Design a protein around this motif. Sequence first.
Motif, PDB file in Angstrom:
ATOM      1  N   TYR A   1      10.118  10.921  11.251  1.00  0.00           N
ATOM      2  CA  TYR A   1       8.779  11.487  11.371  1.00  0.00           C
ATOM      3  C   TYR A   1       7.867  10.689  12.248  1.00  0.00           C
ATOM      4  O   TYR A   1       6.757  11.154  12.589  1.00  0.00           O
ATOM      5  CB  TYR A   1       8.137  11.665   9.992  1.00  0.00           C
ATOM      6  N   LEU A   2       8.295   9.489  12.619  1.00  0.00           N
ATOM      7  CA  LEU A   2       7.495   8.625  13.478  1.00  0.00           C
ATOM      8  C   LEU A   2       8.004   8.648  14.915  1.00  0.00           C
ATOM      9  O   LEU A   2       7.460   7.969  15.785  1.00  0.00           O
ATOM     10  CB  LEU A   2       7.496   7.191  12.942  1.00  0.00           C
TER      11      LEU A   2
ATOM     12  N   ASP B   1       0.819  -1.208   0.000  1.00  0.00           N
ATOM     13  CA  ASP B   1       0.000   0.000   0.000  1.00  0.00           C
ATOM     14  C   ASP B   1       0.858   1.265   0.000  1.00  0.00           C
ATOM     15  O   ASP B   1       1.249   1.754  -1.057  1.00  0.00           O
ATOM     16  CB  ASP B   1      -0.971   0.001   1.186  1.00  0.00           C
ATOM     17  N   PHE B   2       1.149   1.790   1.187  1.00  0.00           N
ATOM     18  CA  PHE B   2       1.948   3.007   1.314  1.00  0.00           C
ATOM     19  C   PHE B   2       3.437   2.717   1.516  1.00  0.00           C
ATOM     20  O   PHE B   2       3.811   1.834   2.287  1.00  0.00           O
ATOM     21  CB  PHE B   2       1.410   3.888   2.455  1.00  0.00           C
ATOM     22  N   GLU B   3       4.282   3.456   0.805  1.00  0.00           N
ATOM     23  CA  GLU B   3       5.723   3.367   1.004  1.00  0.00           C
ATOM     24  C   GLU B   3       6.055   3.895   2.391  1.00  0.00           C
ATOM     25  O   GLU B   3       5.486   4.898   2.829  1.00  0.00           O
ATOM     26  CB  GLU B   3       6.469   4.167  -0.067  1.00  0.00           C
ATOM     27  N   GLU B   4       6.947   3.199   3.093  1.00  0.00           N
ATOM     28  CA  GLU B   4       7.365   3.610   4.428  1.00  0.00           C
ATOM     29  C   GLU B   4       7.941   5.020   4.384  1.00  0.00           C
ATOM     30  O   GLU B   4       8.663   5.378   3.455  1.00  0.00           O
ATOM     31  CB  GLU B   4       8.388   2.626   4.999  1.00  0.00           C
ATOM     32  N   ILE B   5       7.597   5.831   5.378  1.00  0.00           N
ATOM     33  CA  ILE B   5       8.169   7.164   5.485  1.00  0.00           C
ATOM     34  C   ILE B   5       9.365   7.141   6.429  1.00  0.00           C
ATOM     35  O   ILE B   5       9.459   6.264   7.288  1.00  0.00           O
ATOM     36  CB  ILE B   5       7.129   8.193   5.967  1.00  0.00           C
ATOM     37  N   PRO B   6      10.292   8.096   6.260  1.00  0.00           N
ATOM     38  CA  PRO B   6      11.488   8.134   7.111  1.00  0.00           C
ATOM     39  C   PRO B   6      11.150   8.048   8.600  1.00  0.00           C
ATOM     40  O   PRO B   6      10.186   8.664   9.054  1.00  0.00           O
ATOM     41  CB  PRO B   6      12.104   9.493   6.777  1.00  0.00           C
TER      42      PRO B   6
END
Lengths: 11, 28, 251
Positions: A9-10, A1-6
């Motif tokens: 930011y988490l 689904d969604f590409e992992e974000i850096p």
Amino acid sequence: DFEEIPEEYLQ
Amino acid sequence: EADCGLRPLFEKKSLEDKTERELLESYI
Amino acid sequence: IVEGSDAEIGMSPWQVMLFRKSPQELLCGASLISDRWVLTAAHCLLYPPWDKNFTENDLLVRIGKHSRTRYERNIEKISMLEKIYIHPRYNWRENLDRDIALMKLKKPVAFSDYIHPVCLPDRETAASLLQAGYKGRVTGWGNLKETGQPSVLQVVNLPIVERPVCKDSTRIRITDNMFCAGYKPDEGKRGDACEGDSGGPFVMKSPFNNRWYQMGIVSWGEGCDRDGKYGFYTHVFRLKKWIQKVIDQFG
Ligand SMILES: N[C@H](Cc1ccccc1)C(=O)N1CCC[C@H]1C(=O)NCc1ccccn1
Ligand SMILES: *[C@@H]1O[C@H](CO)[C@@H](O)[C@H](O)[C@H]1NC(C)=O
Ligand code: NA
Ligand code: NA
């Protein structure tokens, strides 16, 4: 689904 | 902002997007 | 967005994606109104009937995007939320009256070719443009059909509808804080917002000063792109005094 974000930011 | 609603890639360069004219034509 | 088309690059630089942290997923659309403030629908954040009540730390906003699912390195910017403000008279119990919320960013976002704020309407621009037949533009990464999902941001232009027609299309009680838009069955053309477009902007380009103004927020509907139904939008100008009060007090 969604590409992992850096991890910075988490933090 | 003073610059609100003026798009860098369109209004700021005097380029029109493909369908904005549809909006203008409806404003009678 | 149903029956729309792919947006052009930079076509909607105020478009914001509300993104759930875990699991990572699209929650809603939203819009950039300054370097620190994002506008959305209250129901994107608070809707008790569906056990929805997000807090600041549940969410991120992603600004400057085009692709729905990709991480757009060097282009998009991702922001954490400092504070959520929901209209104090948001009516989630009945009809989504006053369906509006603000989110203050922890840090200002840098403007770019792909990131730039939309204007909020003044009384005169609202009076001039919010007329039946006049078209606005809705953008979002929501579903392509009621019953799938786009690769990139979608756009559709839709005419504002006469208030009696809005009222007669639905059993839900409509208020002055709402307007509706979409084509009639006889008009041939179609298009609508759909699930996932919620909270995103309905904009109009003023023919007086050539600037884009956000007149509406994607709020509610019955299905998506149904004949004889219309999308309903939060009337941003009617609620602008609240917007101004929040920004003045907490900005
Ligand atoms: N279908 C409901 C109709 C409704 C309206 C007002 C109060 C209760 C129920 C709806 O649109 N809802 C129920 C709660 C949120 C909203 C929704 O789905 N909004 C997103 C949406 C709707 C239509 C098109 C695009 N996005
Ligand atoms: C939603 O969340 C807030 C904070 O956790 C809570 O105080 C509130 O009672 C909840 N329900 C609402 C606002 O309807
Ligand atoms: Na009715
Ligand atoms: Na319809």
